Write an enzyme that holds these catalytic residues in place. Sequence first.
Site, PDB file in Angstrom:
ATOM      1  N   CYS A 286       6.935   1.927   5.691  1.00 42.70           N
ATOM      2  CA  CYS A 286       5.383   1.227   5.429  1.00 42.70           C
ATOM      3  C   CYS A 286       5.279   0.267   6.828  1.00 42.70           C
ATOM      4  CB  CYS A 286       5.648   0.300   4.453  1.00 42.70           C
ATOM      5  SG  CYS A 286       6.904  -1.177   4.558  1.00 42.70           S
TER       6      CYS A 286
ATOM      7  N   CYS B 225       2.702  -2.297   6.061  1.00 43.35           N
ATOM      8  CA  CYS B 225       3.506  -3.425   6.010  1.00 43.35           C
ATOM      9  C   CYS B 225       3.590  -3.815   7.332  1.00 43.35           C
ATOM     10  CB  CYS B 225       4.609  -3.673   5.007  1.00 43.35           C
ATOM     11  SG  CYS B 225       6.050  -2.673   5.854  1.00 43.35           S
TER      12      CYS B 225
END
EC number: 3.2.2.-
Length: 252
Positions: A75, A157
């Site tokens: 991520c 992320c």
Amino acid sequence: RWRQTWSGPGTTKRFPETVLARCVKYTEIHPEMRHVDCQSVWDAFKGAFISKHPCDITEEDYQPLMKLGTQTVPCNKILLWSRIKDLAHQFTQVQRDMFTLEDTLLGYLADDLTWCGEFDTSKINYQSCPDWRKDCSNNPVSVFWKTVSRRFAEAACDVVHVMLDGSRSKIFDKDSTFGSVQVHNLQPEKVQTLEAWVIHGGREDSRDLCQDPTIKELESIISKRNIQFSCKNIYRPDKFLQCVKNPEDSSC
Ligand SMILES: N=c1c2ncn3c2ncn1[C@@H]1O[C@H](COP(=O)(O)OP(=O)(O)OC[C@H]2O[C@@H]3[C@H](O)[C@H]2O)[C@@H](O)[C@H]1O
């Protein structure tokens, strides 16, 4: 014939065989995707748009396929891009520093394809499909890319990278899928920074495009979502790719 139902080009020729083959192939290269049954993927896909009016397509129509294509991409290594396809891909191909949409199973199945059906019929329409702009935005292709692009922003992320085409007058374009789906769907609990790479197109290293009006916009949009913003020009993308292939290969 001389008229055609819609303003857009029609289904990419031999669409089913192509998507199914791309399925097999992807499930062969990438091992955490070997549980996937490709015929199943195809049936999900087909069932999203077959026998639907191609202007009355929803994200839900796609959820069976989104479920079969479920995938974790690291991520923190996500590369978003807008309107600069080839550099983004040549870049991730060197040593997999980053993943784009098209490195996912779903994004690799649809990339560079066109598809639609008919309301009255289960037939794939090879003759014409709706145009985003002249006909309707709720068409099979547009709806697919919006849903998959949203999910992909929402998966991200840490430091997220976006590549942008600085040869466009609207380098950050609020009306692109980046500017109107992804920018709004980055999760501020998880995304620490959006880092823009503004890819120059010529005269090598022109002006500092990180001072571009649209870039100051992107920035304030993202800042107010409580995500930090960072920008970097890429003056000579050719040199940038040669640096990635050979770091400390003389300039790199
Ligand atoms: N891989 C493709 C693709 N291949 C062909 N096409 C793709 N569209 C989007 N995607 C991906 O979704 C993202 C968002 O789509 P969008 O910026 O709206 O492409 P746009 O600059 O709006 O181009 C959209 C059109 O270009 C075609 C589609 O037939 C049609 O979606 C793109 O960045 C790209 O990763």
